[PDB]
Each structure stands twice: as C-alpha cells, then as structure tokens.
Design an enzyme around this catalytic site. Structure first.
Site, PDB file in Angstrom:
ATOM      1  N   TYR B 142       0.841  -1.195   0.000  1.00  0.00           N
ATOM      2  CA  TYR B 142       0.000   0.000   0.000  1.00  0.00           C
ATOM      3  C   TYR B 142       0.880   1.250   0.000  1.00  0.00           C
ATOM      4  O   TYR B 142       1.832   1.344   0.784  1.00  0.00           O
ATOM      5  CB  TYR B 142      -0.948  -0.033   1.215  1.00  0.00           C
ATOM      6  CG  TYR B 142      -1.838   1.180   1.368  1.00  0.00           C
ATOM      7  CD1 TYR B 142      -2.992   1.324   0.600  1.00  0.00           C
ATOM      8  CD2 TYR B 142      -1.561   2.156   2.321  1.00  0.00           C
ATOM      9  CE1 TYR B 142      -3.823   2.436   0.745  1.00  0.00           C
ATOM     10  CE2 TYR B 142      -2.385   3.271   2.475  1.00  0.00           C
ATOM     11  CZ  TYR B 142      -3.524   3.399   1.695  1.00  0.00           C
ATOM     12  OH  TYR B 142      -4.337   4.497   1.842  1.00  0.00           O
ATOM     13  N   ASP B 219       9.745   3.543  -2.060  1.00  0.00           N
ATOM     14  CA  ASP B 219       8.826   4.099  -1.079  1.00  0.00           C
ATOM     15  C   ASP B 219       9.368   3.826   0.318  1.00  0.00           C
ATOM     16  O   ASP B 219       9.168   2.740   0.854  1.00  0.00           O
ATOM     17  CB  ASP B 219       7.414   3.507  -1.261  1.00  0.00           C
ATOM     18  CG  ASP B 219       6.392   3.997  -0.232  1.00  0.00           C
ATOM     19  OD1 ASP B 219       6.739   4.865   0.590  1.00  0.00           O
ATOM     20  OD2 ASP B 219       5.243   3.540  -0.278  1.00  0.00           O
ATOM     21  N   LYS B 247       6.346  10.015   7.868  1.00  0.00           N
ATOM     22  CA  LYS B 247       6.426   9.499   9.217  1.00  0.00           C
ATOM     23  C   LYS B 247       7.532  10.152  10.050  1.00  0.00           C
ATOM     24  O   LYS B 247       7.346  11.225  10.604  1.00  0.00           O
ATOM     25  CB  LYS B 247       6.472   7.968   9.211  1.00  0.00           C
ATOM     26  CG  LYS B 247       5.180   7.367   8.656  1.00  0.00           C
ATOM     27  CD  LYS B 247       5.213   5.859   8.583  1.00  0.00           C
ATOM     28  CE  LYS B 247       3.921   5.305   8.001  1.00  0.00           C
ATOM     29  NZ  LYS B 247       2.737   5.598   8.844  1.00  0.00           N
TER      30      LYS B 247
END
Ligand code: NA
Ligand code: NA
Lengths: 406, 406
Positions: B142, B219, B247
């Site tokens: 994802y 990613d 994050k």
C-alpha cells in the site's frame, strides 16, 4: 540582497523552483517570494523583520488571526501528552460532537488529515452509495492544455459544468440520467478568486440532484466557518447530502472532515461496504477544537462581515476616485478583487477577462505599502477577526496610493 | 463499563464505526478499541490510566519513543511564531538540506503534507518525465473483490506483480516494453506485515528499470530512518531514481517528502512541465528537524537494531519452548510476527497462510499483559529508542505466558 533573496537562492539548489508549493514561487505575480519568520494577529513578519497587514490568513485557516492565544495554549497543553498515538482519543469524539453541533446538516462525521482527503472521501462515498460513476464539478473550482503526469483516462467520469449556470448542469444530467453519483460544488468559489453564487444557483443544484437521484456535496473546506458559523450552505439556505470541511477546523494545522446524512454516512466501513487516507492529528484537532469554541461565541460573524464590508466599500471608493475599473466580491470573511471594466464578476469567463498584468503591478505595489495579498489573480482574499478598523483604513489608504500609480 | 467503552459508545453515534481510521476499530482483532490519553517513551497510557509497552509507535513516526524532549521543545518554540503562514520559511530550506544530507541519493527534494502525497507526486513525476502511463506495484503493498466507490477504469494503468518475485516483474515489462513509467516498491514490505526483500530482489528491480527505461521509485515512508539512517535503499545497497519519505521526517506530525536525481526533479514546475497537494506544515517540519538531528548521532542505529534483534530472539525462543510455530522477520527497527508452520515468510502468499485467529487471541492476551501490538495480522511492529532491555525482557516474558495459552 535581503535574507529572503538569500534563502530563495539557497532553496533553488535543493528544491525545484525554490518552493514546495508552486503558487508560493510568486509565478502568478513575478519576482522573488517573501520568506516569513513569524505571524501575530493581522500581521506577517518576513525574515528581514518587515511587517505586513495580511489578507492571505495562511489560505483561510487563520480566522482569529495568526497566533491566537486560545489556539496556542490548547496546542502547547496537547503537545505535553505526545504528538500522535495511532489509536483513537477522547478529542476525536469531542471534535465530532462540536462540528455536528455547529453544522447541523451533519448527523455523522469523519475526520481526515486534509481538506483534499475530505473531498476525495466524500466523492468516493457518493459513488459507493449511489452505485454510479460520474461526478459533476465546475470549471475554475479545485477540490484537490492537458497536464503531463496523469493518464488521459483519469478524467473519463468527470463532467465539467459552468459555475453559476444551471442550464449546463441540466444538460450534463440529461446526457447521463442514471449515471451521476454527485455534484461537488464550492458554495462560494474561491479557487478562481472569490465568486459568490447567484441566488438561483445553489437551490437549483439541490433541485437537479433531487430530480436525477444524485447526491449534493457542498465543499466548505474554504467557506466553512468563514462565510458563516454553520457554513455558506446555511447563509444561502441550501441543505446538502454531504459537507466537506478543512482549514479553520484545524486552527492553523492541516485537518479535514466530511459528514452528512446519517444513512449516507452509514454506508462507510465497518458499518457499510464503502472503504476510504489518514485520521486527524491530535495536536491539529486540539487547535481546531479551541478555534471552533472561540468563533461560536455571540457577535463573531457580525464583526467579521462588518470588517470585510468596510474593506470592500473603501477599496471600491478608492478605485473610483483614481479612475481604476474594479469589481469587489465579498461574503462573510471572504473577498475578491477584480481589475475589469465589467459591471459584475459572476463566472469563470469574467475572471479570465480581468487585467492580470494590472493585478501583478498592484500586488507588488501593495507589498511595498506593507500589505500582503494573495499573490495570484485567481485567489480569494481573507479577513481575520484580529484586523482592526485602523488596519482596514491603512489598507484602503495604501490601495488608493497604489491605484493612483496604475 | 470502562472510560474507553463509554467513549466508543459515544463515538458510534456520530462517527461511522466509532473510529476515524477503520483499522483503529479493532476489526482485525475484534473487541472494543483502546482510547489513548497520553504517551511517553516506550509507553501508551489509555483513558483508564493503564500503561502499555508500545510496539505501534504511532505507525512508525516515534523512532525516539513518544513525547521525546528534543521534539517537544522544538514544537513548543515553533508554535510561538504561529502554526502556518501560506508562504515559504527558512525551515523549508534547512529541512531540505538535512534530508538531502542524510539520504545522499536525493539531489533535490520537495516537502508535502503526507506520505500518500509524496508517493502520488513521485508516481506523477515518473509518468511526466518518461511520458509513459503504466506503473508496476506489488500485491500486499500500500502506497496511499472490487471495492465500491472507485470506477473500474481507475486501475487500468496499474500492473500488479508479486513481491520478492523478479520473474513476474520481467513478465509485466515484456508485455509492455515502452509503456512502464516506473516501479514503486517498499524496500521492506510493511503493509502485509514485515517482509524483508530477498538479496536478489531490489538489485533485480534496479536492473529491470535500467533495461526497459523505467524509473525506480523506492517508497521509504515507513522504512526511511527506521531500517537505517540513509534508508533501506542504503542497507540493501540499491540506488533509486526517486525516494518517498514520511512518518519519522515529521517527528510525530504528518509530513511527506519526495526526492531523487537532479534531472528527474528538474521536470517539476516551475522549472519543468510536470505539476503536482499541500506543502509541509512549519510545526511538523520543526518536529521532524529535531527528530532527524537526534537520530543522526553516532550509535543510534546500532542500539535500535540490537533492541529489535533481542526482542526477535526472545520471541522465537519463547514460542519454541511453548510449542507454538512462529516466524519472526526483522530489520533495523522493524519487525513482524507470523503464526505459521512455514520455515520462512518471504511473500504475500506466506502471509495469507498464517493463522489469523491465533494472532487475534495472542493480540488480546498481550493487551492484558500490558503490551500494545499492532491490532492486525497484516501490520509490522515498531521498535523505539526509548525501549529499555527491561521493557524487552518484560515483553518476551509476557509473550511466553501468552504462547502457553494458545
Ligand atoms: Na453586508
Ligand atoms: Na542483526
């Protein structure tokens, strides 16, 4: 070379165009962008220490002005408990209760990380709830020729209509009677500058959605809590199926929310089959909670509207005295300036016909006068509750001196 | 009825399913979710005051543990200057310099509002730069059967391949030799639980992109600053065209960034033709700046890896003693638990073959032991620098008692 010019040169080596947001590159107006050190009330302070009367309000979040003490206090207190948890909090519940209290059309609500996530989530919900694929959107309206990077088939289920033109909307519905899941509309256009709706327009969209079985999504990311406490939908007396919120609900930090009729919202998972994104940050929700508590007090919107109306009146009078054709659009704490010979500005075509080079010279002249306006001809202006009558008269006096030089 | 149970009942009246994020509804594990009052170091404190050793770390941001003093101090100081400005700041430049220093493969960088915006912006850039439409992604991965709400033609230009399977990637390229703009890959899978790459896998993706003229997008929203200081790309010795970050770079508040080769990034507007989203919030960038300054100190990753390795070793030994088949995957400060008889877990099919009902009972038994694990079989675990050897031995002792009850 100023500190802003040095930071811009430095930024250009590591960031394409020297900015993270292309509008902040001053492409709309030209020249080197202003780097900002801090902000307080109605003012911005650049890195060279120059003060500016601000009409950008961080793009609409700063309804109470910059660095409001109640918001600053709520965030300093919340920060002691940790920045994020990845688990639900009591603030999520309290914030959902406050937002549904203030905007009564929302029976249920979900908080998301930004205004863009809220509009996308509302569009996905409408498609899932109705089982239809097409959406109606308006030209000049951004919710979050052909541009490189996106495949051609991406805009296949989007029908673009003309803002303030009910005939173009009926035509799209008549082409696709059982295929339109929703209409998404900014109740006051803000991304083609400020364009209030015609009296017939928003009730006409509600009647068309009802006729053809589509949902009416009202995008109040910018108008929410700015036009009126209960939104521009309350001001224009229209009841939508879904509402999108952002900006002010975060008190200066990114927050989004989407809400609406109980039976539509019940179609979201785990209760229903529609799946959506990131939840609201606790610090941002503490900022928003404090902001919403403050603006729901008696007399707030009356004061905001009076400040905005006095600016609009002064600017119109200044332009007329200086023989500069100007249209000013304004509603609640929102406004728009248009250098045009037209009597009114009610659509995208009117905005396109404005004198963009005149706006560019006006913008730079106003920066020299210590007034910070949105650096684009296609962006709305924002009033804050921290602006004083003296700030407004100083702005009107500065605009008159700038109009004399155009 | 506890305070969490009362908040959940309250939340269900106004929020579909009582939560903003469906995973936080405990759908993966069952039962009523835990509402969190505060967090400090290695611990979460629920609204009833119960303390838990945390292995969620707010989904990866809390590398230094919760409420780290250096991060808290940087945000309290930044908040005094105002929450947002809508104009560039010196922190944007300083943060871009620090991120490109730490992750050397990035010549240029752009800050965005979230990890999702960074991956979407990197994908749009690859499409614009190459002029190709198709993308390769991996199953179980994802980045931000058929679900209602999205039209069928939305996934037309996405090619799904098998994680850790170079043959499926070659097959997709051989089908579309001149049409693949990029491969987007999590260098360590984290959204199907923790799945490290096979030694051949990431260099094999680099060689396939080179062969067929595609860009390699790595990613690192979750792996960035967690697997290693310079990312999992540094750890696995692979050089991408673009990197996505999130994050940890926000120090607990949402922040995203995407960066890469100078000539690819130069294709972004105003320098080039590709247009992208919201910029990084100043408070979030102050949090991230302080976080990145702290973790770039000597010995940090050595300590993080040693803590994670000691947990993995203890859990394996505890499961074996209690005759519970278990696989533990771990790299840097990331780990994954798998209830399976398989010798290794290297792919999506292995994850699907794990005993999900056993994980659900383990998760609830561990909550009773004061240990907060990700409440899903398909989510990775996170180690923080605030976890002590005593926290780790307490967790291993609690897992052994839970394994004895399975
Ligand atoms: Na009025
Ligand atoms: Na090791």
């Amino acid at each position: 070379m100023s500190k802003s010019e040095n930071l811009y040169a430095q930024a250009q080596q590591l960031i394409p165009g020297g900015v993270n947001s292309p509008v902040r590159a001053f492409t709309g107006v030209g020249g080197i962008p202003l780097f900002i050190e801090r902000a307080d009330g109605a003012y911005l302070f650049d890195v060279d220490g120059k003060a500016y009367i601000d009409y950008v309000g961080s793009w609409g979040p700063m309804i109470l002005g910059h660095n409001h003490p109640a918001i600053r206090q709520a965030v300093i207190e919340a920060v002691e408990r940790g920045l994020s948890f990845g688990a639900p909090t009591e603030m999520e519940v309290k914030m959902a209760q406050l937002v549904t209290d203030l905007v009564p059309t929302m029976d249920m609500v979900r908080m998301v990380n930004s205004g863009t996530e809220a509009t996308m989530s509302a569009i996905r919900l409408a498609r899932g709830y109705t089982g239809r694929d097409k959406i109606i959107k308006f030209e000049g309206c951004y919710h979050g020729p052909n541009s490189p990077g996106v495949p051609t088939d991406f805009a296949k289920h989007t029908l673009t209509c003309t803002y303030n033109d009910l005939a173009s909307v009926r035509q799209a519905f008549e082409q696709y009677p059982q295929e339109v899941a929703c209409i998404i509309v900014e109740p006051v256009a803000g991304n083609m500058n400020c364009i209030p709706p015609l009296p017939e327009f928003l009730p006409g969209l509600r009647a068309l959605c009802d006729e053809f079985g589509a949902l009416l999504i009202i995008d109040e990311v910018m108008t929410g809590f700015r036009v009126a406490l209960a939104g521009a939908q309350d001001y224009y007396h229209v009841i939508p199926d879904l509402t999108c919120l952002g900006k002010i609900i975060g008190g200066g930090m990114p927050v989004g929310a989407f809400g609406g009729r109980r039976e539509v919202m019940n179609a979201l998972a785990p209760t229903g089959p529609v799946y959506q994104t990131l939840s609201g940050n606790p610090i941002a929700m503490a900022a928003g909670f404090a902001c919403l508590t403050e603006i729901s007090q008696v007399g707030v919107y009356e004061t905001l509207t009076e400040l905005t109306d006095s600016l609009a009146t002064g600017l119109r009078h200044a332009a007329k005295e200086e023989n500069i054709p100007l249209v000013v659009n304004h509603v609640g704490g929102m406004f728009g300036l248009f250098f045009t010979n037209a009597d009114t500005v009610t659509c995208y075509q009117d905005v396109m016909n404005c004198d963009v080079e005149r706006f560019k010279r006006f913008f730079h002249l106003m920066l020299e006068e210590g007034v910070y306006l949105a650096p684009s001809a296609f962006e709305a202006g924002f009033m804050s509750l921290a602006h004083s009558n003296e700030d407004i008269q100083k702005t009107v006096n500065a605009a008159r001196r700038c109009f004399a030089k155009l």
